[PDB]
């Protein structure tokens, strides 16, 4: 199947409390493999997946200073964007950056992306074609003009369809044992009377990987969005994920509601029904 590499960065100004907190995290698919935390004792890019630990001290020496550079850029940008938005020097603000690339089963480039946010809102993003930028508002258009000047899009394209796609392809082999696996969802339903005449049907999916999944409830074959409680997909903490969906039903009609589970490791869509005798 398809694979991805992604880096997430967060920079949080702490006015009068020293430099901004800086936390970086790298993933392959839904598996974390590196991290950097400005407040952590190490002050180095640390490994976080077994198969990346073999990388030599040159790898960790590079990554440490590069990820620190990105941190210093976010340190200036916090001040610049403060000006663009005419904000005081007393408030805490947040820059967030996400970038990476996607490949197919054969290791060929599919997609590159970069997106930036300020205080949790869209700021500027690189377009799908990797040539042009979309700024979210008029302040971010100032940056878009700076970056169109200095041809950042072309230097960045270098990484997103070049360096990125090659190192993804290495990692995917250094860790071929753990990363190529797909675990399909163990499924089952539960039933909880809320009273004498209504009950909660809860459709569970556990132990799956990757985290993408779909749960849907059908009443006589029709999709009920009524009384449908869906939780966020969550990590088991072992590399797998969990999700559930629930619908409140009239007691004695449990047979007419059916739950549907779609996942990549599933040869056909699972269909589950509460089976009263």
């Amino acid at each position: 199947g398809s694979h991805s590499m992604r880096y997430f960065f967060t920079s949080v100004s702490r006015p009068g409390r020293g430099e901004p907190r800086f936390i970086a995290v790298g993933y392959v698919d839904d598996t974390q493999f590196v991290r950097f935390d400005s407040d952590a004792a190490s002050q180095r890019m640390e490994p976080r997946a077994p198969w990346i630990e073999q990388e030599g001290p040159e790898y960790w020496d590079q990554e440490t200073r590069n990820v620190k550079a990105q941190s210093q850029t976010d340190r200036v940008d916090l001040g610049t964007l403060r000006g663009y938005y005419n904000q005081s020097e007393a408030g805490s603000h947040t820059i967030q950056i996400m970038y990476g690339c996607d490949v197919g089963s054969d290791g060929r480039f599919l997609r590159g992306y970069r997106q930036d946010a300020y205080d949790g809102k869209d700021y500027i993003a690189l377009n799908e074609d990797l040539r042009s930028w979309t700024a979210a508002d008029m302040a971010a258009q100032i940056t878009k003009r700076k970056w169109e000047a200095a041809h950042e899009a072309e230097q960045l394209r270098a990484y997103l369809d070049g360096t990125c796609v090659e190192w993804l392809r290495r990692y995917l082999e250094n860790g071929k044992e753990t990363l190529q696996r797909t675990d399909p969802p163990k499924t089952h339903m539960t039933h909880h009377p809320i009273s004498d005449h209504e009950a909660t049907l809860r459709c569970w999916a556990l132990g799956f990987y990757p985290a993408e999944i779909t749960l849907t409830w059908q009443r006589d074959g029709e999709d009920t969005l009524t009384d449908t409680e869906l939780v966020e997909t969550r990590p088991a903490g072992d590399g797998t994920f969990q999700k559930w969906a629930a619908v409140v039903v009239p007691s004695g009609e449990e047979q007419r509601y059916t739950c549907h589970v779609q996942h990549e490791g599933l040869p056909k869509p699972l269909t589950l029904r509460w089976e009263l005798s």
């Binding site: 990554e63 990820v67 990105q70 850029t73 964007l81 940056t143 700076k146 960045l156």
Partner: peptide
Amino acid sequence: VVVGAVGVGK
């Protein structure tokens, strides 16, 4: 690997 080329600011 992260980006190597240090960017220009915002």
